[PDB]
């Protein structure tokens, strides 16, 4: 196989989807074949489609979905509101292992945070990480409360021996406020900050995003994810 | 001695102080002696003092604290920006133990969420709850994301064998709304929801607040605390 990464966040609305796109765009630019997998998508009735947005920002075509639910809610609630069932654990692992292949970076974007339920009963992105043996890239904010949320997410990763690939501040303000600046420093003492994506990165066009992505991440880290 | 309950939140700005006040009010109105200890406070530049807020809302007089930083940041960063260290783990645990006496519900209010640095060296509210054999009451929101944050926090509690005294929804919105209605049922499926506090209860005078507080909590669970 290749390298599988679950992209998770300390919370909802932290920029996971554009981090996903950024690392995909940066990894394409290092000659790495990228597949992006969103096994559970909610809010489709409101237009939400994270796989689609990764294609528009990162130019990725190897996009893999599975479950889509209309209501913008936690997957368990969005499914029930629509009379549909959650997928099974093995249906999600199968979707991932099928995309996997050597020399490929496969990105698995979660639904909201790490312990959100994606399959019955209480199956989470973290259990999926264990099954496909993936490390976890954690997307964070620079805002107040980030440290507690980051530390909680990291502790939950370690408790199942899932590897932390590092953090990404999903939306970085220019100029940084005082709060944002201390949080960025405090976050680096917690773990490695692989990138800090500029706010508004999702309104960039194809070339601007690709440029942004190549500068956001350390080339050597990106290249070292696939061997 | 008595009962020591730590009150923590899944995050900042979730109504943790109001919940502290409301539980203190409800407990007093069952004839329980209540103290509230908030070791570290921040944000006292932009007009704060959560202990004063508890005193005004709940009428508690045993209000104990050790440190206050003006910056609206987590302790460690407010302390760092201040040029002045956080209290020692010793100071906090000894103060909580000094407060704790028979018949008394001593509430311990954290600074932010469960796992931020509270004392030296790198001690958290979780370490404090362990040292004083305190259960933890977790304040949660009803908004999208609460279920993740609440599992994360309950997992962090169980990991160190800190008992969980239940959850409290800090701000119940009016009208509820689609996700909040769902989360309430979902939250009730992870842990006992001791109360959901109406939004805006901070602006209430003392008589209204105490009436809201008596209504909010199950009178028999409040009394069984002590
Ligand atoms: N670096 C970032 C991060 C996020 N966003 C936008 O903000 C929302 C998620 O944070 C989403 O609406 C996303 O498009 C952005 O534009 N740039
Ligand atoms: N049930 C609640 C909970 C919170 N609040 C107010 O909202 C602010 C943010 O937590 C709090 O500081 C407090 O002013 C409220 O009014 N009623």
From Swiss-Prot, chain B:
Pathway: Cofactor biosynthesis; biotin biosynthesis; biotin from 7,8-diaminononanoate: step 1/2. GO terms for cellular component: cytosol. It catalyses: (7R,8S)-7,8-diammoniononanoate + CO2 + ATP = (4R,5S)-dethiobiotin + ADP + phosphate + 3 H(+). InterPro entries: DTB_synth_BioD (IPR004472), P-loop_NTPase (IPR027417). ATP binds at residues 13-18, 50, 109-112, 170-171, 198-200. The keyword ATP-binding applies. Its cofactor is Mg(2+). It comes from the Bacteria. Transmembrane segments: none annotated. Its EC number is 6.3.3.3. One of its GO terms (biological process) is biotin biosynthetic process. Keywords: ATP-binding, Biotin biosynthesis, Cytoplasm, Ligase, Magnesium, Metal-binding, Nucleotide-binding. GO terms for molecular function: ATP binding; dethiobiotin synthase activity; magnesium ion binding. Substrate binds at residue 42. It is an enzyme of class 6 (ligase). The active site is at 38. Catalyzes a mechanistically unusual reaction, the ATP-dependent insertion of CO2 between the N7 and N8 nitrogen atoms of 7,8-diaminopelargonic acid (DAPA, also called 7,8-diammoniononanoate) to form a ureido ring. Homodimer. HAMAP family: BioD. PANTHER family: DETHIOBIOTIN SYNTHETASE. Belongs to the dethiobiotin synthetase family. This is ATP-dependent dethiobiotin synthetase BioD. It comes from Mycobacterium tuberculosis (strain ATCC 25177 / H37Ra).
